[PDB]
Design a protein around this nucleic acid. Structure first.
Ligand SMILES: OC[C@H]1O[C@@](CO)(O[C@H]2O[C@H](CO)[C@@H](O)[C@H](O)[C@H]2O)[C@@H](O)[C@@H]1O
Ligand SMILES: OC[C@H]1O[C@@](CO)(O[C@H]2O[C@H](CO)[C@@H](O)[C@H](O)[C@H]2O)[C@@H](O)[C@@H]1O
Length: 580
DNA sequence: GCATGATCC
DNA sequence: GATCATGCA
C-alpha cells in the first residue's frame, strides 16, 4: 500500500520542525555541481515532498537548512552538503547519518542506499535506489509521482531507523565513534572536496606531449625487436610474441593465459632486449593514459580544479578512499612519474602546499597495542626501525647491517604492517616460503610481545566473532572458523592487521578534526585539501608556513596518547611535488 | 571480467 | 594484504 504524504507546492512552518529526516536527492554518482532532483521531509507533523526549485528558493527553508539547532537525520549527508555547497547553501544540524551508522555497525555489508541499511533491521518498506533509477544507459530520474514516493519512503525509513541504529551503536560502544568522529569528519571532507585542488593543466599537457613522443619511439623499437607489429597492451598478443615467437621461458601463468606482469618481465630481460623496451613502454603508457589523460578528463575547465570524492563508508579498516580522480595513488617512487605532482598547485598566488605525514604510525600503534618492550624501546629512541629490525632478526650490530639486510628487514616490517602472508613475503623477497617463514620466526624471537599479540588477537577474534580498533571501530571475521586453510588464514591475518591499520585510520581522522578546530581558533586561512595514506595535505598563504610548521605536527602528534610517541614529518613548497 | 600497475613499502 | 583506474576482450 502506498505511503501517504503531502506533495507540497510551497514550504510551510510545520515542515520546519526542530527534528526531521531529510532527503536532498542527488542521483548523479558524482555529486559535484550536480542537480538536486527532489526533497523529502519527514517529522512529527507528517511526510512532505518539496520540489527543489521551490524549496531551495524559499528563504525560510534555506534558513532551516542552515540552522544548527534544527536537527536532521539523513543518509550520506556529505553528498547533500556538497551538492548544496555548489548552490551556495549551507547544511547544518545533521545529527544522524544512516550511511555512516550502517558502515560502523558492519563495514562488510557494503551498504550504499537506504534500502540496504534498512534491511539490517528487517525494514523493507523502501526500494533500492537501483530499482527506481535503474543502471547504466538507463539510470534516469523517474516521473514525479514515482520519485516523490521513493524519497518519502527513504525519509520515512531514516526516521524509523535512527533509534534502532543508535541503540546498537551504543551497545557496541560505538556511539561516540559516530557522533564525535565520523559525522564531524563528514563535514570536513565535504569542505575539502568542495574546495578541490588546482591543477596546472598546461604543465600536464606538455608532459603528455613528451610522453607521446617517447611512447612512439619505444613502440617502434618493440615492433622492430619482434619483427612485426601487435597491440602491446594486449597481454594475449604480447604473450604470443614473447612465449611463442621469441620462445622466452614461461615462469608464471595466469588463469586466462601467459603472465606478462613487470614481475615476470624483469626476470626475462636477460633473455631478450624486447623485454626492457616493453617494461619502459608499460611505465610510460601507465603515466600517459592513467595520470596525464586521466586527470585532464576530470579537471573542471572553468576553475582548473579537480574535486575528488572521498568514500567514507567503504574500507573494512576505516581508511578513506578517493575517486574521480583518485588522488591517493599519484606517482612518487620513480622520478618520471613523480613529476606529475608539479601539476598540483595552490589555488591562489602566494599560497603554498603544506604536507605532513605520520612516520611509521602502524608499527608505533603495534608497539602500543602489543606492549612489546623491544618495539616500544625502539620507538622511544626514535631509531630507524628497519635497521633495528635487521639488527635483531640477523643478530648483528648497527654497523654490520648491509643495504640488502635492511631491505629484507623492511620487507618483513611491510608484511607486518599490511598483513601479508608468508607466501606474499616470499614473492616479495623473491625467496621461498620456508625461507620467509624463517625470517618471520626470527622476528617473533626478537619481538615476543608482537607474537603474543598475534596469537591472542586471533583467539579473541574467534571468541567474540570480531576485532576492534583503538576508537572502537569493528570488523566481523566469520571466516575465522572456516575449515578451508586459505580462507581461514586470510581471516586470521585480518584479525591481526585490522586493529593495527584500523587504529592508525582512527588517529588520522581525529587529527583532521582536531586540526580544523585549531586552524579556526587561530583564525588561519590554511585549509585541508587531501588525506592520503598517513598524511594530511593542505594549502595556505606563504605567510602561514612558519606557524603551520609548529601547529600541524603538534596537533597530529597529540591526536591520541599511546605508550610510544607519535612522529610527524612535514614539508611545503610551490607545488605538491615540492612538499617533499 | 581479467590483467595490469600506481599508491601504501 | 589495501585502494582505484586503465586498455583489452
Ligand atoms: O556519495 C558517496 C557515497 O555514496 C556511495 C553510495 O551511494 O557511493 C556512490 O558514490 C560514489 C562517488 O561518486 C561512487 O564511487 C559509488 O560507485 C556510488 O555508488 C557510498 O559508497 C559513498 O560513501
Ligand atoms: O598452534 C597455535 C598457533 O597456530 C595458529 C596459526 O596461525 O592457529 C591455529 O591453532 C589455533 C589453536 O590454538 C586455532 O584456533 C586456529 O584456527 C589455527 O589456525 C596461531 O594463531 C596460534 O598461535
Amino acid at each position: 500500500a502506498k505511503m501517504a504524504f503531502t506533495l507540497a507546492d510551497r514550504v510551510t512552518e510545520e515542515m520546519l520542525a526542530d527534528k526531521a529526516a531529510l532527503v536532498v536527492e542527488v542521483v548523479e554518482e558524482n555529486y559535484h555541481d550536480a542537480p538536486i532532483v527532489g526533497i523529502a521531509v519527514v517529522n512529527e507533523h507528517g511526510r512532505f515532498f518539496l520540489r527543489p526549485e521551490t524549496a531551495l528558493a524559499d528563504p525560510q527553508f534555506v534558513a532551516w537548512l542552515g540552522d544548527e539547532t534544527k536537527k536532521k537525520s539523513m543518509f550520506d549527508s556529505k553528498r547533500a552538503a556538497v551538492a548544496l555547497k555548489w548552490k551556495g547553501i549551507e547544511l547544518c544540524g545533521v545529527s544522524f547519518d544512516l550511511l555512516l551508522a550502517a558502515y560502523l555497525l558492519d563495514p562488510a555489508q557494503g551498504v550504499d542506499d537506504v534500502a540496504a541499511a534498512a534491511k539490517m533491521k528487517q525494514y523493507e518498506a523502501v526500494r533500492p535506489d537501483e530499482a527506481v533509477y535503474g543502471k547504466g544507459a538507463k539510470r534516469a530520474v523517474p516521473d514525479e509521482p514515482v520519485l516523490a514516493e521513493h524519497l518519502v519512503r527513504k525519509a520515512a525509513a531514516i526516521w524509523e531507523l535512527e533509534r534502532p541504529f543508535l541503540d546498537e551503536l551504543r551497545r557496541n560502544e560505538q556511539d561516540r565513534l559516530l557522533v564525535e568522529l565520523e559525522q564531524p569528519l563528514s563535514s570536513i571532507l565535504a569542505e575539502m572536496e568542495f574546495a578541490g585542488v588546482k591543477v596546472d593543466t598546461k604543465r600536464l599537457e606538455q608532459m603528455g606531449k613528451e610522453l607521446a613522443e617517447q611512447l612512439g619511439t619505444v613502440e617502434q623499437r618493440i615492433y622492430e625487436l619482434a619483427g612485426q607489429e601487435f597491440n602491446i597492451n594486449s597481454p594475449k598478443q604480447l604473450g604470443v610474441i614473447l612465449f611463442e615467437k621469441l620462445q622466452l621461458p614461461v615462469l608464471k601463468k595466469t588463469k586466462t593465459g601467459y603472465s606478462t606482469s613487470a614481475d615476470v618481465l624483469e626476470k626475462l630481460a636477460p633473455y631478450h632486449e624486447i623485454v626492457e623496451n616493453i617494461l619502459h613502454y608499460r611505465q610510460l603508457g601507465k603515466l600517459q593514459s592513467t595520470y596525464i589523460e586521466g586527470l585532464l578528463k576530470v579537471v573542471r575547465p572553468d576553475t582548473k580544479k579537480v574535486h575528488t570524492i572521498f568514500n567514507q563508508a567503504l574500507t573494512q579498516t576505516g581508511r578513506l578512499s578517493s575517486t574521480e580522480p583518485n588522488l591517493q595513488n599519484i606517482p612518487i617512487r620513480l622520478e618520471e612519474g613523480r613529476k606529475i605532482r608539479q601539476a598540483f598547485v595552490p589555488s591562489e598566488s602566494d599560497w603554498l602546499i603544506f604536507a605532513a605525514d605520520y612516520s611509521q604510525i602502524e608499527l608505533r600503534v603495534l608497539a602500543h597495542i602489543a606492549e612489546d618492550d623491544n618495539l616500544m624501546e625502539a620507538f622511544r629512541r626514535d631509531l630507524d626501525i628497519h635497521t633495528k629490525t635487521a639488527m635483531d632478526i640477523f643478530q648483528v650490530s648497527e654497523d654490520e647491517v648491509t643495504p640488502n639486510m635492511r631491505r629484507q628487514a623492511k620487507a618483513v616490517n611491510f608484511g607486518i604492517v599490511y598483513g601479508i602472508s608468508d607466501y606474499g613475503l616470499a614473492q616479495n623477497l623473491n625467496i621461498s616460503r620456508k625461507e620467509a617463514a624463517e625470517f618471520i620466526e626470527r622476528y617473533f624471537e626478537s619481538f615476543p610481545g608482537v607474537k603474543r599479540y598475534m596469537e591472542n588477537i586471533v583467539q579473541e577474534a574467534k571468541q567474540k566473532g570480531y576485532v576492534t580498533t583503538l576508537l572502537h571501530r569493528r570488523r566481523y571475521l566469520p571466516d575465522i572458523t572456516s575449515r578451508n586453510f586459505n580462507v581461514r588464514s586470510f581471516a586470521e591475518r585480518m584479525a591481526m592487521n585490522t586493529p593495527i591499520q584500523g587504529s592508525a585510520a582512527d588517529i588520522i581522522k581525529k587529527a583532521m578534526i582536531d586540526l580544523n578546530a585549531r586552524l579556526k581558533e587561530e583564525r588561519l586561512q590554511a585549509h585541508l585539501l587531501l588525506q592520503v595514506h598517513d598524511e594530511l595535505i593542505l594549502e595556505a598563504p606563504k605567510e602561514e608556513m612558519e606557524r603551520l610548521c609548529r601547529l600541524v605536527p603538534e596537533v597530529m602528534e597529540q591526536a591520541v596518547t599511546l605508550r610510544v610517541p607519535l612522529k610527524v614529518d612535514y614539508h611545503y613548497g610551490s607545488t605538491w611535488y615540492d612538499a617533499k
